[PDB]
Amino acid sequence: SRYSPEFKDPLIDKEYYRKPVEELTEEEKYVRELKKTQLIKAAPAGKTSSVFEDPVISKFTNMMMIGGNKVLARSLMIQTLEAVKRKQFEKYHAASAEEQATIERNPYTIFHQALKNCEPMIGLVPILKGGRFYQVPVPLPDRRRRFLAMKWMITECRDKKHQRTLMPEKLSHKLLEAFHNQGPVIKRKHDLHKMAEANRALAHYR
Amino acid sequence: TEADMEEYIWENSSSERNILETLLQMKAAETKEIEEYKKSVVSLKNEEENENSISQYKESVKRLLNVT
Amino acid sequence: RRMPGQCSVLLFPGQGSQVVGMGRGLLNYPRVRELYAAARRVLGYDLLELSLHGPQETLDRTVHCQPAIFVASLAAVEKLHHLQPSVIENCVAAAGFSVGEFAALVFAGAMEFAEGLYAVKIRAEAMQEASEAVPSGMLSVLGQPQSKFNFACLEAREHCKSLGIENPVCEVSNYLFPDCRVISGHQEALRFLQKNSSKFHFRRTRMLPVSGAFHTRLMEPAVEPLTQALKAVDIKKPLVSVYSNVHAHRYRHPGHIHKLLAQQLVSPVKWEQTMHAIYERKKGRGFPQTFEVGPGRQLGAILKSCNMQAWKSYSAVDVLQTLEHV
Amino acid sequence: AISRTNENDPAKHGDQHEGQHYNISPQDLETVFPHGLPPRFVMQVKTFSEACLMVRKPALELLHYLKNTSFAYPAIRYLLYGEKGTGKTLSLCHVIHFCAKQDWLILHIPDAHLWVKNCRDLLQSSYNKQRFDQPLEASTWLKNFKTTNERFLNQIKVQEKYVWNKRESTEKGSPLGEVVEQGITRVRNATDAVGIVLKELKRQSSLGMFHLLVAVDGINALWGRTTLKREDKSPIAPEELALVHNLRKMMKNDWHGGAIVSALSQTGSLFKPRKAYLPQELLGKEGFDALDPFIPILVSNYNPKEFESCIQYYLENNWLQHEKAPTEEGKKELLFLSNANPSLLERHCAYL
Ligand SMILES: Nc1ncnc2c1ncn2[C@@H]1O[C@H](COP(=O)(O)OP(=O)(O)OP(=O)(O)O)[C@@H](O)[C@H]1O
Ligand SMILES: Nc1nc2c(ncn2[C@@H]2O[C@H](COP(=O)(O)OP(=O)(O)O)[C@@H](O)[C@H]2O)c(=O)[nH]1
Ligand SMILES: [Mg+2]
């Protein structure tokens, strides 16, 4: 690494600094004073104090990226968001008066809820002890399941069975399916929760 | 060759022919203006084309064509 | 020396590329009417009328399609020479598929029109007789990474042995591009392969509209006739590098073309090997221009499957229409 | 609805309607604009279930020029120019909608760049063996021309016998619609049918039968270069295309009774840098000589009033779903990111 150990990661949170000194606790006052002495790394290209910034969508875009072509990944992400928005508007214009109150048109809300609906809380850990592999249930950390939902969504959208259907169109369809607890990603979560319930007797190996 | 030569001569030019034809047609339907028109044309043809030159040409053409 | 990019490689199509309207767009070009007149003189019927306006059923016949493709290929060569003299002047390699081989040699100055057309005629007639002798056919099979071709041919032969016939024939007849081959042999074996594609891991299967199993030992009776017709012909040294189909390498000495043109009749077509031998090179180095002189665009798709980068500089001569009336 | 104007009549818009959106009816949409609107504005029309155009200074000035136009003088050439995505196409659409409501005859070319690139059925004209026909591009335009000007096709009549082939000919005095039909039914004569129409419309308008508008978007294609090739892989010049050759005659001010309005476009242009937007740079010497004399009209980015009104329009259509968008900080961020460019603002708002 080209940064010395003294260098610390920057804090881009804009409203953190505007906090009144009166609200600051003694510990928070101390750490604010301490950061004065520390050296701070240059903020990386990426996160910004923008009010429209979304770390989850940024991570999804980075996970779609191939060969460092970030422009194309962000283009695909924004196209997916626009497609979801337009599909929801089309479904809203054609809905009954009482059905328009339960139709979400915010693409960010749909994206977050669809990813949350696919998060597995339990997983397996291959462990060979007696000469034969043994899959044991283990509770998944929050970061692990957040990553797994994204990875499953992207892998499902990268299947070759979808011939000539462009990535934004496939991803919008999968997101809207997972928003309603439907589709193959929700089934992949269910088949993991079931295959980890089928081996609850193997937890004693942990 | 005219390309090698560093001058667009407004005399005996397509701009002059077109404006002469247009004014003859206007008179049939019915100068300092032509001087400023040729100045703007020569500027746009020889110097750099900026929006100031474009606006000068616009004003000259409007005055010649009776557009307000 | 010349760099790759101003040189040119001419590819000649084979049987299965015939089409009604073939020949239109080439007639008004120089020297084509004389070639069709020579075709009439040698054959004994009006190839021109059949190629232009035909029922497509008389044209799909083996005795009629191959000479039509031959004459159309050479007419397209004449058209290309008229349009682009430099391309014909800067020619490095030539290759034909099954019958277009006879065209490439005639283009390379190893044969003249009359002898080549006579060879093609006798070849087509003998192949038609051989196909009539025993029921047979050709099946295009597109496999996946888990597909075993020799294995599947083995069970396809076991089926016919169980039914009971003398030495069932079912082997790969054409290597076109990766994981796609053309199997040839008795219709029972091909039906077995079609109905057991799922077990054999064949993504697609399509029976070819051909008379019989070409490029197999079943065509052996058609070897002795053609040989005699080739015996009289004096084959010269090709001026350009003409590639073979039996072993997919350049013809070296003219005295070996005589027997290779007969082995090609009863040997698999090594098209993928020929494409490698012509276009193989290191990454980054330039590729030559490619011109498909003849009907259809099948060789274009095959080259696309084989080499994308070589396919980037590929173009086809239009033998159905001409932009300008010369 | 501060961003909307109740005056949906383009003939009565003035400086007090600047920054306000006026509605185009579905009937006017399908009649006046089968092809004119930009591709990404049609998505907004389909999503909002309504077409609304902001009234801006370029369109107001070009409308004031067309209201005071003398129909005895030769037709005046108006050229809309500006940076990429500044709204010149929609200003031309506003002017076309104004002219249509006053029973003008509309000759609208939605994009002249399509005629000089990516043509798969290129033919050689039987009329003139040195030119090429584009039946697919000519027949597509003929149908929409028929749609826009269906009323006049029976009032307007030819003054010559046009011979499509030895069997078929259009006799003198037949309605112009027949000619259009012959171009729509048999594509082989589509390109020949377009030119005749132009030849008629330029002539009859001089007689005073009707007022003609020539609306050519992406006019810079006519005097540039083409990406179309012969069978010998040789380049083809724009003048060798009959469709392009006949449309140049309409840009010349050798006829009266109408106005010529055009808009430049680097989007889809051939052999032009991304940042070239000025008249000479995009037109070329030949194009400038052809159009000269002409009146250029500048189209710029949104001023603060227009930017605020556009964001209020999107908010009224509930098109900004992010919670921070309606706030003031989000408006500053959008203003900075787009720099008031209409196209960038629309694209950014599309996915928020
Ligand atoms: N008057 C307007 N009313 C509403 N939206 C507008 C207006 N002008 C511009 N826009 C917005 O800007 C987008 C781009 O406008 P337009 O297509 O007219 O640009 P242009 O300057 O002609 O572009 P280009 O240089 O690419 O040809 C439109 O789709 C619409 O989103
Ligand atoms: N098929 C056909 N097309 C015609 C006929 N007359 C004119 N046109 C077409 O309509 C266009 C009218 O343009 P025109 O005044 O004749 O200019 P020109 O081509 O130089 O002679 C021509 O370019 C032709 O393409 C005709 O009698 N038959
Ligand atoms: Mg435009």
Side-chain angles (χ1 to χ4, degrees):
Chain A
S1 178
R2 306 295 287 277
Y3 282 114
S4 312
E6 293 71 32
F7 278 85
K8 310 303 182 188
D9 292 309
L11 183 64
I12 314 305
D13 190 9
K14 181 177 172 66
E15 293 296 72
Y16 167 85
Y17 297 103
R18 282 88 171 94
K19 174 156 287 196
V21 181
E22 301 172 351
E23 297 189 10
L24 295 180
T25 61
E26 288 184 344
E27 304 178 351
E28 195 169 342
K29 194 168 188 178
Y30 168 82
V31 68
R32 186 193 218 81
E33 283 184 21
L34 177 42
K35 291 211 76 188
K36 299 194 178 181
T37 59
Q38 290 164 10
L39 292 157
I40 311 298
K41 300 185 181 199
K47 185 177 180 180
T48 301
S49 52
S50 189
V51 301
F52 306 118
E53 198 92 16
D54 207 314
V56 183
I57 287 175
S58 302
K59 207 68 173 175
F60 196 90
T61 303
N62 289 353
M63 293 177 70
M64 294 183 286
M65 184 167 44
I66 296 165
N69 196 5
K70 209 170 212 172
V71 173
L72 180 61
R74 175 142 186 76
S75 173
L76 294 168
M77 198 58 235
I78 64 177
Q79 289 176 47
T80 298
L81 291 171
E82 185 194 356
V84 169
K85 201 179 181 183
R86 289 192 193 284
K87 284 181 187 188
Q88 290 303 78
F89 269 71
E90 183 178 1
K91 182 180 172 183
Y92 185 99
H93 274 95
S96 173
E98 294 293 328
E99 299 172 19
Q100 284 178 354
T102 187
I103 290 170
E104 188 65 26
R105 289 182 295 178
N106 190 357
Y108 296 93
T109 296
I110 295 170
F111 181 84
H112 288 288
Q113 191 61 24
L115 285 184
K116 182 175 174 66
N117 289 347
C118 299
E119 293 186 2
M121 65 182 179
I122 62 171
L124 305 176
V125 178
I127 281 160
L128 185 140
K129 299 289 94 175
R132 325 293 172 180
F133 290 95
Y134 295 132
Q135 321 282 35
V136 62
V138 181
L140 295 175
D142 186 74
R143 68 180 65 252
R144 182 57 183 163
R145 54 169 162 267
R146 272 199 264 106
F147 174 91
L148 283 176
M150 285 162 186
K151 182 68 176 177
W152 292 349
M153 184 65 71
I154 297 166
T155 296
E156 178 58 37
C157 293
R158 283 174 177 182
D159 291 331
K160 298 293 183 182
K161 186 180 289 293
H162 307 110
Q163 183 59 255
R164 277 257 298 273
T165 313
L166 300 170
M167 181 68 171
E169 182 65 26
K170 303 183 289 194
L171 188 58
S172 67
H173 183 72
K174 298 306 181 186
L175 285 173
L176 286 168
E177 273 185 337
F179 186 60
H180 297 111
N181 296 282
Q182 291 286 336
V185 187
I186 303 291
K187 177 166 161 287
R188 182 163 181 168
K189 180 188 78 173
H190 291 164
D191 303 331
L192 183 73
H193 286 178
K194 282 184 308 201
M195 150 168 84
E197 192 177 33
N199 307 284
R200 62 179 292 162
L202 280 69
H204 294 88
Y205 293 99
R206 169 191 174 220
Chain B
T1 292
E2 296 295 328
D4 302 348
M5 294 298 102
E6 311 180 355
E7 183 62 17
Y8 160 81
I9 298 93
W10 196 83
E11 282 77 355
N12 307 286
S13 71
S14 54
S15 184
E16 179 171 22
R17 277 185 272 101
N18 295 339
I19 200 72
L20 175 67
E21 182 65 26
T22 307
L23 296 184
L24 266 70
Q25 288 175 119
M26 293 177 70
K27 290 183 185 294
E30 287 176 353
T31 68
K32 296 189 75 172
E33 285 177 3
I34 286 288
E35 187 62 50
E36 63 164 10
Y37 174 58
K38 72 167 281 172
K39 181 178 77 181
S40 309
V41 171
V42 167
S43 297
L44 283 166
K45 292 268 182 178
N46 290 327
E47 319 175 351
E48 184 64 25
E49 175 167 86
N50 56 336
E51 278 168 288
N52 205 302
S53 59
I54 291 292
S55 70
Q56 187 194 309
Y57 175 84
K58 178 190 176 179
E59 290 296 305
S60 72
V61 169
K62 278 172 68 177
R63 296 291 185 269
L64 276 171
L65 302 180
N66 296 9
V67 181
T68 48
Chain C
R1 186 179 295 275
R2 292 188 296 272
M3 283 73 74
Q6 62 183 356
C7 297
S8 72
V9 176
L10 277 50
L11 296 184
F12 291 74
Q15 181 169 355
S17 66
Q18 61 264 359
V19 62
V20 298
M22 182 179 72
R24 293 187 292 110
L26 303 150
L27 298 170
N28 186 233
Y29 276 89
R31 195 136 74 209
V32 175
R33 311 239 182 212
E34 293 175 352
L35 288 189
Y36 275 100
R40 185 267 182 275
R41 292 183 291 113
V42 161
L43 291 169
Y45 77 80
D46 189 358
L47 197 53
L48 181 68
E49 200 206 331
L50 185 66
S51 59
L52 273 67
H53 294 89
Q56 185 66 77
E57 303 318 286
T58 302
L59 196 57
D60 291 331
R61 288 167 64 203
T62 311
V63 60
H64 291 318
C65 71
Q66 275 168 43
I69 295 155
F70 177 39
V71 181
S73 292
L74 291 165
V77 166
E78 306 277 9
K79 159 156 173 192
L80 201 56
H81 192 30
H82 174 269
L83 300 168
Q84 289 178 354
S86 60
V87 167
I88 303 295
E89 183 62 27
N90 296 318
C91 186
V92 298
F97 187 79
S98 66
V99 59
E101 190 54 276
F102 288 89
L105 289 163
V106 175
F107 157 76
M111 294 177 71
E112 284 281 298
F113 200 81
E115 300 90 342
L117 183 63
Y118 180 35
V120 165
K121 179 176 77 72
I122 194 50
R123 183 177 185 273
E125 293 179 353
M127 293 177 70
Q128 184 63 45
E129 291 290 327
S131 177
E132 284 211 282
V134 161
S136 296
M138 294 177 71
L139 163 53
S140 189
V141 302
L142 177 60
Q144 73 187 4
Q146 295 178 357
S147 66
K148 277 74 69 177
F149 286 110
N150 188 359
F151 181 71
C153 293
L154 196 147
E155 292 84 4
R157 271 174 261 144
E158 296 307 283
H159 187 193
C160 192
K161 297 296 289 183
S162 83
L163 294 174
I165 297 169
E166 294 293 328
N167 309 149
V169 192
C170 181
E171 47 271 56
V172 165
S173 57
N174 287 59
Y175 316 82
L176 296 176
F177 57 91
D179 294 322
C180 185
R181 279 89 179 88
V182 183
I183 301 299
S184 291
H186 288 78
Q187 295 100 323
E188 297 92 324
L190 313 169
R191 287 180 248 135
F192 187 75
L193 294 175
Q194 184 178 2
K195 67 190 287 186
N196 296 115
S197 63
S198 295
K199 278 72 176 175
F200 295 135
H201 299 276
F202 295 158
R203 292 183 291 113
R204 291 185 74 242
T205 53
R206 207 168 65 72
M207 185 64 72
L208 278 299
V210 285
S211 281
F214 308 139
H215 306 307
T216 59
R217 66 181 294 276
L218 283 171
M219 296 299 290
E220 186 64 24
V223 173
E224 184 47 66
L226 171 66
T227 300
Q228 302 303 68
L230 279 165
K231 182 63 69 177
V233 180
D234 189 358
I235 304 174
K236 281 77 174 177
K237 179 174 73 69
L239 304 171
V240 290
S241 310
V242 182
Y243 282 72
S244 187
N245 280 325
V246 175
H247 62 283
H249 295 311
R250 176 191 316 172
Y251 284 120
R252 214 69 82 191
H253 187 273
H256 294 149
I257 302 169
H258 273 280
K259 68 181 178 67
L260 280 159
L261 272 176
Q263 289 178 2
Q264 188 274 330
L265 187 62
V266 297
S267 291
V269 165
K270 296 289 181 70
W271 194 242
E272 204 197 331
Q273 292 81 15
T274 306
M275 292 292 101
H276 282 319
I278 299 173
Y279 298 107
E280 180 66 25
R281 59 199 68 213
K282 298 291 183 181
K283 291 177 70 68
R285 294 179 66 88
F287 289 82
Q289 293 179 356
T290 304
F291 287 87
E292 183 178 1
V293 300
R297 305 153 56 71
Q298 317 191 112
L299 303 192
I302 295 164
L303 178 61
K304 196 182 169 142
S305 308
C306 279
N307 297 55
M308 294 299 291
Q309 311 299 304
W311 184 82
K312 292 182 186 295
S313 59
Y314 157 84
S315 62
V317 186
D318 209 319
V319 301
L320 288 165
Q321 184 178 2
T322 187
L323 178 78
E324 291 180 355
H325 175 284
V326 63
Chain D
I2 184 171
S3 58
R4 291 175 182 265
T5 183
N6 290 318
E7 185 60 290
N8 61 53
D9 181 9
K12 303 188 180 185
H13 292 148
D15 287 331
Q16 71 280 14
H17 297 115
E18 178 183 355
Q20 302 173 8
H21 296 73
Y22 87 101
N23 178 45
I24 309 176
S25 63
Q27 183 62 255
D28 266 344
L29 265 175
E30 65 183 1
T31 297
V32 183
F33 304 103
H35 55 100
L37 303 176
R40 198 164 178 85
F41 184 82
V42 179
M43 302 167 176
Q44 168 172 325
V45 173
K46 179 187 216 281
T47 297
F48 294 179
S49 302
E50 58 159 338
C52 296
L53 294 183
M54 193 188 290
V55 184
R56 304 181 64 192
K57 289 182 180 180
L60 287 172
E61 159 182 344
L62 187 46
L63 289 170
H64 179 264
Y65 291 152
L66 290 178
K67 284 178 188 172
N68 316 132
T69 187
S70 297
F71 294 85
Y73 291 139
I76 299 176
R77 281 75 64 82
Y78 303 98
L79 185 70
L80 282 158
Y81 73 108
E83 293 179 353
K84 186 167 185 162
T86 48
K88 39 197 179 304
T89 293
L90 279 174
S91 295
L92 184 67
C93 290
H94 192 145
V95 174
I96 292 163
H97 189 239
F98 161 79
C99 290
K101 296 289 98 176
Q102 294 189 357
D103 297 357
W104 288 41
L105 183 63
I106 302 300
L107 192 72
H108 179 24
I109 311 297
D111 194 17
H113 290 114
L114 302 176
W115 296 355
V116 294
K117 66 188 179 181
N118 301 333
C119 190
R120 299 291 179 90
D121 44 16
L122 197 75
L123 319 183
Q124 193 183 260
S125 295
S126 62
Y127 197 69
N128 186 332
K129 299 298 293 295
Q130 296 294 321
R131 306 217 209 99
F132 302 93
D133 284 33
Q134 295 170 320
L136 183 63
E137 287 78 1
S139 56
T140 301
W141 178 85
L142 275 170
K143 296 177 185 175
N144 307 278
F145 171 81
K146 172 178 172 307
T147 313
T148 309
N149 310 287
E150 182 64 26
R151 315 171 289 220
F152 306 98
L153 297 198
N154 296 115
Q155 320 175 357
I156 297 165
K157 295 179 183 293
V158 300
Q159 293 82 17
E160 291 184 9
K161 178 171 143 155
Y162 298 109
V163 298
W164 307 108
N165 64 7
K166 300 292 181 183
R167 286 201 167 186
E168 264 179 281
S169 71
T170 303
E171 300 299 314
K172 180 185 301 186
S174 297
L176 191 63
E178 287 190 9
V179 174
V180 178
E181 290 292 331
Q182 186 63 27
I184 281 171
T185 307
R186 296 291 185 269
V187 289
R188 200 193 83 241
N189 319 299
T191 302
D192 291 331
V194 165
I196 287 152
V197 166
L198 308 200
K199 184 197 194 172
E200 291 298 344
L201 298 199
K202 167 158 141 167
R203 178 206 285 149
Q204 295 201 32
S205 80
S206 300
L207 307 183
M209 293 180 183
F210 49 79
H211 302 322
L212 179 68
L213 180 73
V214 180
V216 183
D217 189 281
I219 190 176
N220 63 7
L222 306 186
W223 301 277
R225 296 167 56 184
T226 73
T227 47
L228 304 177
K229 300 293 184 180
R230 277 187 176 74
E231 280 187 354
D232 77 322
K233 299 291 180 68
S234 79
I236 291 167
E239 62 272 11
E240 281 168 319
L241 304 170
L243 215 57
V244 171
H245 177 266
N246 291 116
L247 187 60
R248 291 183 182 184
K249 304 174 186 173
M250 295 299 291
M251 319 321 298
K252 181 69 176 177
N253 61 343
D254 54 41
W255 54 285
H256 52 93
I260 305 164
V261 188
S262 57
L264 296 172
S265 181
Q266 192 274 337
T267 306
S269 65
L270 300 170
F271 309 96
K272 300 291 182 182
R274 175 179 58 88
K275 271 175 291 189
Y277 79 96
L278 288 164
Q280 188 142 31
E281 311 177 316
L282 282 178
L283 287 165
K285 300 294 187 291
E286 178 170 23
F288 192 93
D289 296 348
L291 288 191
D292 182 310
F294 68 92
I295 306 187
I297 301 174
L298 174 65
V299 189
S300 299
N301 290 351
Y302 287 146
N303 55 25
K305 181 192 296 180
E306 289 171 344
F307 174 84
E308 180 55 25
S309 64
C310 177
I311 281 185
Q312 289 298 325
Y313 176 74
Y314 287 150
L315 288 171
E316 290 169 33
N317 289 291
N318 304 311
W319 184 242
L320 306 183
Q321 290 288 282
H322 206 283
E323 65 183 1
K324 303 292 178 182
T327 63
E328 190 277 331
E329 191 175 17
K331 291 163 181 182
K332 287 177 150 293
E333 281 196 48
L334 289 163
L335 181 60
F336 184 93
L337 286 178
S338 62
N339 198 355
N341 188 253
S343 193
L344 290 182
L345 179 66
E346 180 264 315
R347 286 166 177 280
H348 198 289
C349 288
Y351 72 85
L352 270 187

